[PDB]
Every structure is written in structure tokens, then in C-alpha cells.
Design a protein around this ligand. Structure first.
Ligand SMILES: *[C@@H]1O[C@H](CO)[C@@H](O[C@@H]2O[C@H](CO)[C@@H](O[C@H]3O[C@H](CO[C@H]4O[C@H](CO)[C@@H](O)[C@H](O)[C@@H]4O[C@@H]4O[C@H](CO)[C@@H](O)[C@H](O)[C@H]4NC(C)=O)[C@@H](O)[C@H](O[C@H]4O[C@H](CO)[C@@H](O)[C@H](O)[C@@H]4O)[C@@H]3O)[C@H](O)[C@H]2NC(C)=O)[C@H](O)[C@H]1NC(C)=O
Ligand SMILES: *[C@@H]1O[C@H](CO)[C@@H](O[C@@H]2O[C@H](CO)[C@@H](O)[C@H](O)[C@H]2NC(C)=O)[C@H](O)[C@H]1NC(C)=O
Ligand SMILES: *[C@H]1O[C@H](CO)[C@@H](O[C@@H]2O[C@H](CO)[C@@H](O)[C@H](O)[C@H]2NC(C)=O)[C@H](O)[C@H]1NC(C)=O
Lengths: 36, 340
């Protein structure tokens, strides 16, 4: 694939920072989306 | 020196990382969602009427090296951070607040009260702890006001003897710099587990993105920005490389990425999400070496002389929704204190 196809179809991590303060607003890990 | 919060900022970060780490250790198989900032400020504005050993653990666990950093300065740092987050963004809403909810009998160490209003701009409320279903109410609302009705039932059971509670929220709503197209959003596979595949709506863009892959972190890393003063970073491990990633994470690394605005052409597939997480943090903060406030050794004599108090609950809840158009999340923390 051109471009490369990056698929977030496996459990990933993420976080939200605020730009200014560079503070870790929110941190997460999804393992199962349908786990509400 | 100048805007001060970056004096505390990595201390926060490395906390988040580490608290996170515990939450991982607990169960490989759950969705994790918290908000570091929200958990932290509470234990910060709590520390401010704790004394001795018990104070020291809180701050400690938060990853502050008191030797290296004037405690007086820590609080300052925080005063700033809050301040700034709550600065009005034209495009993006981010709001947090802190409340103290007090049994109308309680005579407070006056200075504790000016401390929290000052430095943590906190709000105070005078309450009957003898109406548990009407107080519980009054609490739930503040938060459910606060997070615009994203969290409603933070307080599920409240103590009959409660002296006071420290409650603290965060609400965030931002829109992607370059949102996705909702047409293109097509229901594709997510492999949860090695045996479990679930179908998820996958939002798709092909375009010029901030992505790369660190041999370092054994992952791909994407940063997505918001219209505002904020950004999201998603870390897709390589295969088997998940705990690898989880460990190697550091604030440095985070700040490195953030300096890049170097784009790349790819095909990005990212699911549409709503998830929550609901935690009783005693235990996991137990791990992070904060234990004295939950026991019979606690010292909240900065709070009130009247009686020896202690913490009996610490409950975080956060919820997030990621869609094409952006994200909105929220988070809340609840601490309850009682006579021993
Ligand atoms: C948390 O994260 C973990 C990753 O570190 C996840 O762990 C993964 O779990 C699977 C579970 O099957 C592991 O599978 C390997 O082995 C099985 C065969 O052996 C066990 O499991 C089957 C049932 O799944 C049983 O029938 C076997 O008897 C044995 O299980 C034990 O059996 C007892 C009697 O029935 C029973 O009482 C026990 O309760 C039971 N379990 C335990 C823990 O004692 C095999 O089927 C798997 O096959 C896949 O992999 C092969 C190699 O690639 C491949 O050829 C094949 O086609 C399949 O793709 C696999 O060999 C797995 O090793 C382990 N680790 C990883 C790397 O995936 C876990 O899923 C996650 N959640 C939780 C809740 O733990
Ligand atoms: C907080 O302060 C302490 C005391 O200075 C630091 O602990 C020691 O630091 C030296 C130099 O790095 C090490 O050789 C010792 O092994 C440390 N002692 C322990 C028990 O680890 C500590 O490093 C400081 N924290 C930070 C973040 O620098
Ligand atoms: C995100 O926060 C920044 C702070 O860096 C905001 O920038 C302010 O912009 C106005 C002019 O529009 C200046 O008068 C201020 O001095 C700036 N900084 C502060 C600290 O107030 C910015 O508005 C925010 N929003 C966006 C769109 O980036």
C-alpha cells in the first residue's frame, strides 16, 4: 500500500495533552471498543 | 520563573504514566480511561491541610521531589496550570473546577480554606451530611453541571458520617484540525484479543498526517491536533510490542514528538469510540505509595482541629467519545473524609 496503511485495528494507546501547558489532559488505552 | 506549570508538568506526566502502569497491571483485558490532571489536582489541593508523613506521601506519589522543589512552589505551579487551562479558547472548551463540600458543623483551619480558594480557585459549599440522598444529590449535580452531563453518577454511595468531600471535575470538547469524512466511515475489524474480533466503525482519511514509527517505542505514533491549543497522540504498537510500548513511555519522548510538525502521506484508519472508566483509587494509589491518608494514621489537622479525619474513598470516573468531528471527554474525581 502506497501510502502505507496504518490501521488502528488492534489495541492501542493514546493521550490528550494541552498544547500550552503540555499537560497530560487525559490518558487512555482501548482494548475493546464495544466494552462500554 | 515565567509560566510556571512546566515546573510541574513532567511531574504530572510521569505520574500519569505510572498510575497508568498500575491500571495496566491490574487487568490486561479492560479499557482504561482516566484523566491525570483531574486525579492530581485533587490530591494536591488535598495535601494542603494534611501534615507530616501523610502529606509527604501524597506529594511524593505525585512524583514531586520536595528536596528539589519548594512545596510552596508546587502549589503555585498548580495554581497556574489551572488558571491557564481555564483560559478562554475561542474554538475549544476546556474547563475544570474544584469544590469542597462541608458539613455545616465543621470549623475549619481558616487558612486551609483560604489556601484552597486561592491557589486552587476552589469553590466551597455548606451541606447537611445528615441528608445522605440530598447531599449525594447536591454533589452529583455540581459535577454533572460541570461536565455538561457527561458524568452524573459519580457518587454512588456516600458515607453516613461524612465530614466533607473534595470533588473535582474536567470537561473537554475539541474539534479535529482536519476532521474526517463521515461517509468514509465504514465498519471494519478490530482484533481485541487473539481470539476475539469485534466489528467497529472505522473512520478513514487518506492524507497528510503527522505520523511515524519509532524503532524506539516499537510502534507507530500519530499526533492529531485540535482546533484550539491541544493535541491527541495515538500509539499503535507493533505486534507483541504492547507492554514494550507501555513501559518505555516517558515525558521526554512525549515532548520530542510534540516538536515535530512533520507530515507524511498515509492511509489512516482509526475507530470511532465511546468508552468509560470508573476507579476506586485507594488501592492503586496504595501502590504508588500513598497510604496514610486512608488509614488510622492520617493527619488532616490542617483541615480541622475538631476531630481526627481520614479518607475513606477515592473515586475517579472518566468517559470519552471520539468521532469524526473531534472528541469530547470528561473526568471527575471524588474524595470523602470521615471521622476515624
Ligand atoms: C490477556 O493477554 C494475554 C497475552 O499475554 C492473552 O493470552 C493469550 O491467551 C490464549 C488463550 O487461548 C493463549 O493461547 C495459546 O494456547 C491455546 C491452547 O492452550 C490453552 O487454551 C485452550 C483454550 O483457549 C485450551 O483448550 C488448552 O487446554 C489451554 O488452556 C487451559 O486449559 C485447561 C483445560 O481446558 C483450562 O482449564 C484452563 O482454564 C486453560 N487456560 C489456562 C490459562 O490454564 C491455543 O489455542 C492458542 O492458539 C493460537 O496461537 C497459536 C500459536 O500462534 C496458533 O497456531 C493458533 O492458530 C492460535 O492462533 C495459543 O497457542 C495465548 O498463548 C496467550 N498469549 C498470547 C501471546 O496470545 C489473553 O488472551 C488476554 N486476556 C486474558 C483474559 O487473559
Ligand atoms: C530526589 O532527591 C533524592 C535525594 O537527593 C535523590 O536520590 C538520590 O539521588 C542520587 C543521585 O541521582 C542517587 O545516586 C541515589 O541513588 C538517590 N537515592 C535513591 C534512594 O534513589 C532523587 O534522585 C531525587 N529525585 C529526582 C527525580 O532526581
Ligand atoms: C490557546 O492559548 C493561547 C496562549 O498561548 C491563546 O493566545 C492568546 O492570544 C491573544 C491574541 O489573540 C493574546 O492577546 C494572548 O496574550 C495569548 N495568550 C494568552 C496566554 O492569553 C489562544 O487564544 C488560544 N487559542 C488558539 C486559537 O490557539
Amino acid at each position: 500500500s502506497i501510502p502505507p496503511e496504518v490501521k488502528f485495528n488492534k489495541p492501542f494507546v493514546f493521550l490528550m495533552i494541552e498544547q500550552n501547558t503540555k499537560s497530560p489532559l487525559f490518558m487512555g488505552k482501548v482494548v475493546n471498543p464495544t466494552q462500554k | 520563573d515565567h509560566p510556571t506549570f512546566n515546573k510541574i508538568t513532567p511531574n504530572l506526566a510521569e505520574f500519569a504514566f505510572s498510575l497508568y502502569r498500575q491500571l495496566a497491571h491490574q487487568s490486561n483485558s479492560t479499557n482504561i480511561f482516566f484523566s491525570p490532571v483531574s486525579i492530581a489536582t485533587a490530591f494536591a489541593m488535598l495535601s494542603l491541610g494534611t501534615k507530616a508523613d501523610t502529606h509527604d506521601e501524597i506529594l511524593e506519589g505525585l512524583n514531586f521531589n520536595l528536596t528539589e522543589i519548594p512545596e510552596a512552589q508546587i502549589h503555585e505551579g498548580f495554581q497556574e496550570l489551572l488558571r491557564t487551562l481555564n483560559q478562554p479558547d475561542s474554538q475549544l472548551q476546556l474547563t475544570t473546577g474544584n469544590g469542597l463540600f462541608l458539613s455545616e458543623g465543621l470549623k475549619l483551619v481558616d487558612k486551609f480554606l483560604e489556601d484552597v480558594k486561592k491557589l486552587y480557585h476552589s469553590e466551597a459549599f455548606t451541606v447537611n451530611f445528615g441528608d445522605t440522598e440530598e447531599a449525594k444529590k447536591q454533589i452529583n449535580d455540581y459535577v454533572e453541571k460541570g461536565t455538561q452531563g457527561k458524568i452524573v453518577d459519580l457518587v454512588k454511595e456516600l458515607d453516613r458520617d461524612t465530614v466533607f468531600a473534595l470533588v473535582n471535575y474536567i470537561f473537554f470538547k475539541g474539534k479535529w484540525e482536519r476532521p474526517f469524512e463521515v461517509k468514509d466511515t465504514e465498519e471494519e475489524d478490530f482484533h481485541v484479543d487473539q481470539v476475539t474480533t469485534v466489528k467497529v466503525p472505522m473512520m478513514k482519511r487518506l492524507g497528510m498526517f503527522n505520523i511515524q514509527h519509532c524503532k524506539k517505542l516499537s510502534s507507530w505514533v500519530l499526533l492529531m491536533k485540535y482546533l484550539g491549543n491541544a493535541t491527541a497522540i495515538f500509539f499503535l504498537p507493533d505486534e507483541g510490542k504492547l507492554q514494550h510500548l507501555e513501559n518505555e513511555l516517558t515525558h521526554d519522548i512525549i515532548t520530542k514528538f510534540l516538536e515535530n510538525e512533520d507530515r507524511r502521506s498515509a492511509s489512516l484508519h482509526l475507530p470511532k469510540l465511546s468508552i468509560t472508566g470508573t476507579y476506586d483509587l485507594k488501592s492503586v494509589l496504595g501502590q504508588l505509595g500513598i497510604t496514610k491518608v486512608f488509614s488510622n494514621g492520617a493527619d488532616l489537622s490542617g483541615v480541622t482541629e475538631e476531630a481526627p479525619l481520614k479518607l475513606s474513598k477515592a473515586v475517579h470516573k472518566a468517559v470519552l467519545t471520539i468521532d469524526e468531528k473531534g472528541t469530547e471527554a470528561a473526568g471527575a474525581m471524588f474524595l470523602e473524609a470521615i471521622p476515624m
